[PDB]
Design a protein around this ligand. Structure first.
Ligand SMILES: Nc1ncnc2c1ncn2[C@@H]1O[C@H](COP(=O)(O)OP(=O)(O)OP(=O)(O)OP(=O)(O)OP(=O)(O)OC[C@H]2O[C@@H](n3cnc4c(N)ncnc43)[C@H](O)[C@@H]2O)[C@@H](O)[C@H]1O
Ligand SMILES: [Zn+2]
Length: 217
């Protein structure tokens, strides 16, 4: 289906994304991941993006919408898709509506994973990423089976440069600044669903599953 996983930095979007892909096998589209790739590719876009990313600020809308416009217009998204960490602003939200309006489609579910700020901060403090697949772990709450090695590919784990305290507080503030309105936009569009993310990973997924697995509740 056409899904959108939103939530503040550290809400467990990627974490829950890996589980949603397994089951339904829908294309995981993460703007955070795409920018990170452009950067690793060394593109001009990646150079300009990193500047904002390092600071913890949003990458300008026009650039962000642009890359999402291109990625979603690809064939591996006709049967469905899982946007992750997008949109984050109202312009992004509308640009996404029109984009799909042309393809004769629409967003069908906006899953908003909610967690209090303090938990969000603890989650980003001791987090680690797999050098090989991008997946994350948490030294305390969700450690890898074997220290420093990804459970999927044995890849090395590392801390995101921006997962430091200063940047984290700026990241949380900037993104929240856009939330309330973005949440209303979707709620008045009858597609939003809040979900308690302040629980075990498995349990947060079941709450997500209920909506994806259609069947009433
Ligand atoms: N649309 C857009 N517009 C403008 N700019 C944009 C943009 N999109 C991206 N950008 C730019 O790119 C930058 C980086 O983007 P991005 O990579 O998307 O950064 P982010 O916003 O900080 O979000 P995260 O992916 O890091 O968090 P997440 O919720 O997936 O967390 P995770 O699952 O690891 O979970 C966190 C930790 O918690 C643990 N965890 C997960 N679930 C649980 C649970 N249930 N209980 C306890 N711990 C848990 C995990 O193990 C992990 O260690 C942005 O700051 C911005 O500059
Ligand atoms: Zn990995």
């Amino acid at each position: 289906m056409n899904i959108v996983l939103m939530g503040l930095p550290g809400a467990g979007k990627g974490t829950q994304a890996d589980r949603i892909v397994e089951k339904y096998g829908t294309p995981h589209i993460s703007t955070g991941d795409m920018f990170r790739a452009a950067i690793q590719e060394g593109t001009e876009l990646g150079v300009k993006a990193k500047s904002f990313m390092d600071q913890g600020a949003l990458v300008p809308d026009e650039v962000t919408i642009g890359i999402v416009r291109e990625r979603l217009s690809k064939s591996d998204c006709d049967n469905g898709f899982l946007l992750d960490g997008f949109p984050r602003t109202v312009p992004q939200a509308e640009a996404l509506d029109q984009l799909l309006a042309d393809m004769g489609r629409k967003i069908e579910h906006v899953l908003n994973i909610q967690v209090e700020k303090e938990e969000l901060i603890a989650r980003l403090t001791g987090r680690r990423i797999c050098k090989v697949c991008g997946t994350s772990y948490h030294l305390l709450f969700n450690p890898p089976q074997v220290e420093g090695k990804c459970d999927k590919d044995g890849g090395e784990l590392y801390q995101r440069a921006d997962d430091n305290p200063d940047t984290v507080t700026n990241r949380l503030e900037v993104n929240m600044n856009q939330t309330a309105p973005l949440l209303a936009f979707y709620d008045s569009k009858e597609v939003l669903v809040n979900i308690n993310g302040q629980k075990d990973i498995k349990d947060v997924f079941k709450d997500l599953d209920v909506i994806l697995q259609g069947n009433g509740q």
